[PDB]
Amino acid sequence: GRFDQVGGAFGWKPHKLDPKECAQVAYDGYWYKGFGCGFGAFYSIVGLMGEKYGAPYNQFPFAMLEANKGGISDWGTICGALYGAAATFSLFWGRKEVHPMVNELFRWYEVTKLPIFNPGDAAQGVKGDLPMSASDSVLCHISVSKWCYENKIEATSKQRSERCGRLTADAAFKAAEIINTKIDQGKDFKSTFPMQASVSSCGECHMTKGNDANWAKGIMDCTPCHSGTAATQNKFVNHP
Amino acid sequence: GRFDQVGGAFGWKPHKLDPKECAQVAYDGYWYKGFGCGFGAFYSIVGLMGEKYGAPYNQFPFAMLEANKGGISDWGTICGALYGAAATFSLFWGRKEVHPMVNELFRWYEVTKLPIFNPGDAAQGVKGDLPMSASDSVLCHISVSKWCYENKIEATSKQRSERCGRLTADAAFKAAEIINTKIDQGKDFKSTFPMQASVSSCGECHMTKGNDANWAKGIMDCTPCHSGTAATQNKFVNHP
Ligand code: HEC
Ligand code: HEC
Ligand code: HEC
Ligand code: HEC
């Protein structure tokens, strides 16, 4: 009936992946027809399962993930690579089970200095080395803008598009490892990245049912936006 | 070949839909197995097309959209309803064409007071009117938290669960209108919502090629985060 689907909800069969292969295809996918972060990462997971094991994986409308490029048509929201990777988890597991998987993928992203991946000369943007940094944000605007600012590189530069291309690979690689670990540990799976400090402490009031201050939703690290930093001071007045 | 898909990229045949139908369906879909905002929205478009026209629409793994519940596994990033609705656009059109569609849907969401949709006695979460407001953000965290704060409503209440359900309906409604208009107008589609003030004013420096300060990526309204409001001041020291 209505709301149901071919194969049932979360009824696809997961298959272990080769993280190295994934990082690679994700990076390549990123440049393909200029589809981007979401497409490359998504494809490196479900796309590779399709090439090796056929249906249902190979029946997916892959380019739909172009939607996530630039945090969804340049709105700079969720980093496309992150969505593309986490979305695949929902093809196999449901809400309760996917939560710790995305928590690990997302918390890892906030703290790890990236990119790590290097295509060598398979580089389609700029060959070379790129500065690494921890974004402390799963949001594209924050991740990209901070890095460009800090490194005096333009968000239009071939470098930042090379950077996002490599990040797609790192996220693909990490997501792949998480999928593998999930297949192994079954319903025992646990995130290896503990809850963020700010999330836990602020959460005491803002994310605890019954609390008079329990208004907030979202477990992104609170630090970037709620720290009174120069960046978050009023830029609409006296801002050269 | 690798990276291609059944039907070619953006190869689906779009069909006009009834906005009021989608709104109703999206609202139901929202509660179905607790799948949420992204599931209802996406389904009310592609799902209905499946029910009414068959393959390929009816072949889609709908439950994957549960990935988006609560701003992606409770992370509070892009609102599930917005992503779910926008995603559908990429099944029929390429990024060039989709950009103005997402721009209108997202801008519409920022400036419009919601929710509008009212299931009356058919409310599946909690019956009754709900306070409306413009979020100024396509991010579930800012949208929800600010609304709970300003109305003193726990983010864990049925009231807010009901609000997000209604919001899903509004989003689905608007996306259908956009899709319909896009079908009629073809390559001449233009968004009714213009670029936000802060984005083009701040963008003059930050999102313009060649300018030293060209570091930012993202066309979200800059006001909530770069205004030095009470909210963005340091909440880590002397708070509350
Ligand atoms: C409970 C002991 C709290 C902790 C821990 C933190 N906050 Fe809080 N916050 C609390 C209350 C009761 C209130 C409202 C009344 C008031 O004191 O003004 C707030 C309000 C906020 C706001 C609103 C804007 C403001 O005026 O400050 C924000 C955006 C907010 N709190 C953020 C926040 C963050 C991110 C925290 C951790 C770093 C944090 N609060 C902890 C109660 C408590
Ligand atoms: C930036 C992307 C943010 C992150 C990460 C977190 N919050 Fe936030 N929060 C942000 C803004 C710009 C706003 C809107 C403020 C406004 O104009 O109303 C909010 C709002 C909240 C609120 C509600 C009170 C309010 O000022 O509206 C709370 C209680 C809050 N945020 C808490 C908070 C905590 C505890 C977070 C970490 C898990 C968190 N926010 C992250 C921007 C951002
Ligand atoms: C050009 C005339 C600009 C306009 C208009 C705005 N910004 Fe800006 N910004 C510009 C420069 C050259 C710099 C360099 C540092 C400085 O203070 O001179 C910046 C920097 C920022 C920053 C980060 C650095 C900081 O002050 O902490 C942010 C967060 C930023 N700008 C945001 C921003 C927004 C939101 C604007 C509109 C309200 C805005 N800027 C306009 C140049 C120009
Ligand atoms: C909140 C959800 C945000 C919105 C909407 C916009 N920006 Fe932003 N911006 C925000 C944060 C938390 C940061 C990181 C600050 C840090 O600690 O480094 C940024 C960063 C930028 C930058 C880079 C410089 C920097 O301070 O790191 C710029 C130039 C900037 N933001 C500009 C800007 C403009 C013009 C926006 C609207 C189109 C905009 N930001 C929205 C948070 C958020």
Side-chain angles (χ1 to χ4, degrees):
Chain A
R2 156 174 302 168
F3 296 141
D4 202 19
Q5 72 208 245
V6 177
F10 321 128
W12 287 13
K13 169 149 290 191
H15 295 280
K16 280 211 168 183
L17 308 142
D18 178 0
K20 314 299 169 300
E21 188 191 16
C22 285
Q24 175 90 22
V25 182
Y27 175 93
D28 292 349
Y30 168 87
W31 307 96
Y32 183 75
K33 293 187 173 184
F35 287 171
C37 5
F39 178 88
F42 187 84
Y43 190 96
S44 75
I45 287 182
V46 178
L48 294 192
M49 289 195 192
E51 292 180 2
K52 297 169 175 47
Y53 317 96
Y57 324 98
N58 78 340
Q59 297 301 294
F60 196 94
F62 300 105
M64 181 188 99
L65 282 109
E66 182 198 48
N68 289 269
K69 207 189 157 173
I72 306 166
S73 274
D74 305 330
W75 277 68
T77 67
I78 179 61
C79 252
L82 291 188
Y83 180 72
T88 69
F89 305 171
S90 289
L91 292 174
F92 317 102
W93 303 279
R95 188 158 86 241
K96 280 176 182 169
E97 284 186 271
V98 179
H99 194 35
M101 301 180 61
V102 171
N103 281 350
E104 158 144 353
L105 180 57
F106 286 16
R107 290 173 189 164
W108 162 81
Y109 185 87
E110 297 182 333
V111 300
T112 299
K113 296 199 182 199
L114 308 158
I116 290 174
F117 178 91
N118 196 324
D121 297 288
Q124 299 189 229
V126 304
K127 246 160 289 158
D129 261 74
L130 286 167
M132 300 166 9
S133 60
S135 54
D136 187 27
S137 178
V138 142
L139 296 183
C140 225
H141 170 69
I142 299 186
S143 175
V144 179
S145 304
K146 195 183 174 186
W147 180 92
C148 283
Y149 175 58
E150 289 179 344
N151 295 285
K152 268 60 198 181
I153 297 160
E154 277 190 65
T156 236
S157 188
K158 279 212 176 194
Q159 280 150 289
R160 91 91 217 140
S161 74
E162 177 64 41
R163 174 208 178 247
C164 282
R166 302 180 188 200
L167 289 184
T168 297
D170 294 319
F173 183 94
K174 180 57 179 183
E177 297 194 332
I178 295 169
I179 284 165
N180 285 343
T181 306
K182 173 58 175 181
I183 296 184
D184 289 337
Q185 301 173 354
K187 297 191 181 179
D188 287 309
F189 184 98
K190 282 177 177 177
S191 176
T192 61
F193 277 79
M195 176 165 280
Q196 304 100 314
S198 65
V199 183
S200 303
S201 61
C202 303
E204 299 258 5
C205 303
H206 298 294
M207 271 91 82
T208 304
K209 191 178 225 236
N211 201 294
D212 308 58
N214 183 31
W215 307 303
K217 274 292 167 175
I219 51 186
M220 278 182 284
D221 187 51
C222 325
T223 303
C225 305
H226 296 297
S227 293
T229 57
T232 71
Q233 288 303 320
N234 192 25
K235 308 282 108 174
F236 289 83
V237 172
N238 173 63
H239 173 63
Chain B
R2 163 169 280 180
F3 297 148
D4 194 48
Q5 70 197 241
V6 191
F10 330 114
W12 295 11
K13 197 87 182 218
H15 299 261
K16 281 188 170 239
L17 307 138
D18 172 16
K20 289 73 177 174
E21 213 197 334
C22 301
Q24 282 178 182
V25 179
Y27 178 96
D28 292 326
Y30 171 96
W31 309 92
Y32 179 81
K33 296 181 155 187
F35 288 173
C37 14
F39 179 78
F42 186 91
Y43 193 85
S44 75
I45 293 166
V46 178
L48 288 195
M49 283 187 198
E51 287 175 18
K52 296 164 162 56
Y53 311 101
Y57 329 101
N58 77 331
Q59 295 306 300
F60 198 95
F62 302 118
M64 182 190 96
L65 281 115
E66 187 193 35
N68 300 283
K69 177 165 170 152
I72 307 184
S73 210
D74 236 44
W75 273 70
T77 70
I78 180 77
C79 256
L82 297 180
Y83 177 78
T88 73
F89 303 162
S90 299
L91 289 167
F92 314 102
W93 299 283
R95 66 184 180 274
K96 219 128 205 129
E97 285 191 270
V98 177
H99 200 205
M101 303 178 60
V102 182
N103 284 352
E104 202 197 288
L105 178 63
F106 285 18
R107 283 159 189 182
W108 162 81
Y109 186 86
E110 287 182 347
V111 313
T112 297
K113 297 184 177 161
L114 309 167
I116 301 166
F117 182 86
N118 196 330
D121 287 310
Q124 300 176 49
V126 96
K127 196 236 150 179
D129 279 348
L130 288 167
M132 302 175 54
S133 61
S135 68
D136 197 13
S137 179
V138 296
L139 300 190
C140 163
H141 168 73
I142 296 174
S143 188
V144 185
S145 298
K146 179 167 56 178
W147 179 88
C148 279
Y149 174 61
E150 296 175 351
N151 290 100
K152 301 286 194 296
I153 293 174
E154 286 202 75
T156 57
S157 70
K158 284 186 174 305
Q159 278 184 106
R160 94 89 212 145
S161 206
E162 176 69 45
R163 179 220 177 236
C164 279
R166 305 196 184 179
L167 243 34
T168 306
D170 296 325
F173 183 94
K174 180 69 178 176
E177 300 199 292
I178 290 178
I179 280 180
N180 289 343
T181 297
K182 172 58 179 182
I183 288 172
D184 283 328
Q185 287 162 214
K187 284 186 161 188
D188 293 283
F189 179 86
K190 298 166 177 196
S191 35
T192 57
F193 285 74
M195 179 168 283
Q196 19 208 285
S198 63
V199 177
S200 49
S201 68
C202 304
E204 279 277 62
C205 283
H206 292 308
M207 287 113 215
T208 309
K209 194 171 199 225
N211 194 304
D212 275 64
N214 183 45
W215 308 305
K217 223 51 165 168
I219 48 181
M220 281 179 289
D221 185 55
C222 323
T223 316
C225 307
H226 295 300
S227 279
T229 62
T232 65
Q233 289 309 326
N234 195 358
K235 304 296 138 187
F236 290 89
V237 183
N238 296 334
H239 176 80

